[PDB]
Amino acid sequence: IMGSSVYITVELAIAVLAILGNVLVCWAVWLNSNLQNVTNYFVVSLAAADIAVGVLAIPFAITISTGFCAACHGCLFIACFVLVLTQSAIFSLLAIAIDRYIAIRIPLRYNGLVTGTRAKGIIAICWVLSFAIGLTPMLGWNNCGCGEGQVACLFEDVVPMNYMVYFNFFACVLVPLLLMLGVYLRIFLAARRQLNIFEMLRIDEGLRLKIYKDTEGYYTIGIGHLLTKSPSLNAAKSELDKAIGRNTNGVITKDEAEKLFNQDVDAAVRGILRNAKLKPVYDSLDAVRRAALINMVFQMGETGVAGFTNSLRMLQQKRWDEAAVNLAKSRWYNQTPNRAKRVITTFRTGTWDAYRSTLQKEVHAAKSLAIIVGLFALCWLPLHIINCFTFFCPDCSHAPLWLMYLAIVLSHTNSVVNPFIYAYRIREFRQTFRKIIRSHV
């Protein structure tokens, strides 16, 4: 085993793997339209970046390890590309994470704030900013045996540490991690929230934090809390302040929406109790099943719920399974099956299972970010930690050599693992990949 021959061979194996693993991703999305959401637009960009490292950044990172003599700007150029090609991969990961953040926490505005048009504009940013940082030394932030105007072509020789540590590390690689981490937790915390009536109707009707026009052009906020039928947005905003009790500018917090929602629930219940046909059924239900009945009122109305004479009878007799089947035959179930299905299950079980199941999609995304952040940090932290010690403790006992180059190997391993791992974990790709493998191979 010659020391570095091993190192180069790994880098080349990564090149192939990086290329191959990434050639697949962009290919799948090409022929399957289910994978042509705005999100996979971000994916194809990352995949392409990770292809570019396999062809140019890898051979460059390798050729920066020989020490041949060449113009400082000609050897800096090479080190700058490998920097640039990697900056993009870092920022491209942000595009995916933040996209997954809004899709989970703010699903309504997703299509509004996240259009296929805008997305392509955000990638343009990620790529330009990558150039801005990687090519900073070429602007003048550099460090310039062999002859005049020729240095030993070595990374540290041409790239100072005050750039790698202060600017590159903290501003370009670290704040991703801290950001990408914040995404993981806040998504994670959303998938594991304690369930209740408020969250229940947030899933069926959707939560709104800014005033919006309902389906009939009446200003509404929260979960279907109408403000006024007046055609004046200023009038609607005024009414909001009356209920909130402060200056809102047309915007409220999540807690304020829950106080409006709670007031609305208290109102629906008082109406149910006035109904000679709904009060007997309402009293004979436990807390969770009462939330299911309130859900039907918030959708149809008391007189509309009262129409279910038979299904209301079985409920008071606690014939849960029998009431469910009868509710399945209603026009209400036929016009909105998804919501009615979750509501019926709540009647059957008296639990939040049907809605808890709705969050399985959330935890899938959470577990999928644990991996991206874990690998990303595992692959990037080592090499940069090494840079820091060299910069702050020159006289220290440097870490072992063979290990140093491994850290370099880890940084490049990110390009092949990170994009493919996200795709392969979301099965729609898996079926698409196998389809390609058998058909063309």
List the catalytic residues. 205, 214
200 closest CA partner among 279, 274, 296: 296
- List binders of ligand UKA among 349-368 (CB under 6 A): none
Reading the block at residue 282, the tokens are 């309402």
Does residue 70 belong to the site contacting ligand UKA (CB under 6 A)? no
Find the shortest distance in angstroms from Cβ 23 to ligand UKA: 21
Find the shortest distance in angstroms from Cβ 154 to ligand UKA: 4
| Residue 235 buriedness (CB in 10 A; 0-12 / 13-18 / 19+) | middle
Helix, strand or coil for residue 152?
A: strand
Choices 203-211, 266-274, 397-405, 422-430; region in contact with ligand UKA by CB under 6 A: 397-405
Find the shortest distance in angstroms from Cβ 28 to ligand UKA: 27
Determine whether the annotation assigns residue 387 to a binding site: yes
Does residue 398 belong to the site contacting ligand UKA (CB under 6 A)? yes
AA letter at 23: V
On whether the CB atoms of residues 376 and 412 are closer than 8 A, the answer is no
Separation CA 191–CA 361 (nearest Å): 8
Which residue lies nearer to ligand UKA by CB, 126 or 294? 126
Does residue 49 belong to the site contacting ligand UKA (CB under 6 A)? no
Determine whether the annotation assigns residue 334 to a binding site: no
Which residue lies nearer to ligand UKA by CB, 82 or 119? 82
- Find the binder of ligand UKA among 15, 96, 173, 221 (CB under 6 A): 173
Does residue 383 belong to the site contacting ligand UKA (CB under 6 A)? yes
Does residue 404 belong to the site contacting ligand UKA (CB under 6 A)? yes
Q: Helices H, strands E: what count in the chain?
A: 24, 5
Q: After which residues is the chain broken (C to N over 2.5 A)?
A: 144
- Find the binder of ligand UKA among 15, 82, 236, 343 (CB under 6 A): 82
Does residue 143 belong to the site contacting ligand UKA (CB under 6 A)? no
Determine whether the annotation assigns residue 298 to a binding site: yes
Which residue lies nearer to ligand UKA by CB, 325 or 403? 403
Separation CA 176–CA 174 (nearest Å): 5
Strand partners, 220: 212, 226
Separation CA 352–CA 286 (nearest Å): 13
Counting Cα atoms < 13 Å in the Cβ hemisphere of 314 gives: 15
Residues 6+ apart with CB under 8 A from 19: 51, 54, 55
Separation CA 207–CA 194 (nearest Å): 17
Which residue lies nearer to ligand UKA by CB, 145 or 217? 145
274 closest CA partner among 251, 307, 298, 306: 306
Does residue 311 belong to the site contacting ligand UKA (CB under 6 A)? no
| Residue 104 buriedness (CB in 10 A; 0-12 / 13-18 / 19+) | buried
Find the shortest distance in angstroms from Cβ 152 to ligand UKA: 9
Determine whether the annotation assigns residue 322 to a binding site: no
Separation CA 328–CA 374 (nearest Å): 45
Does residue 291 belong to the site contacting ligand UKA (CB under 6 A)? no
Find the shortest distance in angstroms from Cβ 405 to ligand UKA: 5
Determine whether the annotation assigns residue 311 to a binding site: yes
- Find the binder of ligand UKA among 401, 438, 439, 441 (CB under 6 A): 401
136 closest CA partner among 171, 98, 105, 175: 171
Find the shortest distance in angstroms from Cβ 54 to ligand UKA: 13
Find the shortest distance in angstroms from Cβ 249 to ligand UKA: 41
- Find the binder of ligand UKA among 138, 179, 328, 386 (CB under 6 A): 386
What Å distances lie between residue 190 and 35, 96, 99, 221, 365, CA to CA? Answer: 25, 18, 16, 21, 11
Which residue lies nearer to ligand UKA by CB, 156 or 241? 156
- List binders of ligand UKA among 146-165 (CB under 6 A): 154-156
| Residue 58 buriedness (CB in 10 A; 0-12 / 13-18 / 19+) | buried
- Find the binder of ligand UKA among 86, 130, 142, 358 (CB under 6 A): 86
Find the shortest distance in angstroms from Cβ 43 to ligand UKA: 21
Separation CA 441–CA 430 (nearest Å): 16
Which residue lies nearer to ligand UKA by CB, 46 or 407? 407
- Find the binder of ligand UKA among 411, 413, 415, 432 (CB under 6 A): 411
Q: Looking at 266-356, which runs of residues are DSSP E strands? A: none
Does residue 7 belong to the site contacting ligand UKA (CB under 6 A)? no
Separation CA 175–CA 173 (nearest Å): 6
Determine whether the annotation assigns residue 45 to a binding site: no
What's the alpha-carbon Rg for the chain, to the nearest Å?
A: 29
Binding residues (CB under 6 A) for ligand UKA: these are: 61, 64-65, 82-83, 86, 154-156, 168, 173, 383, 386-387, 390, 398, 401, 404-405, 407-408, 411-412
Known binding positions for substrate: 226, 298, 311, 326
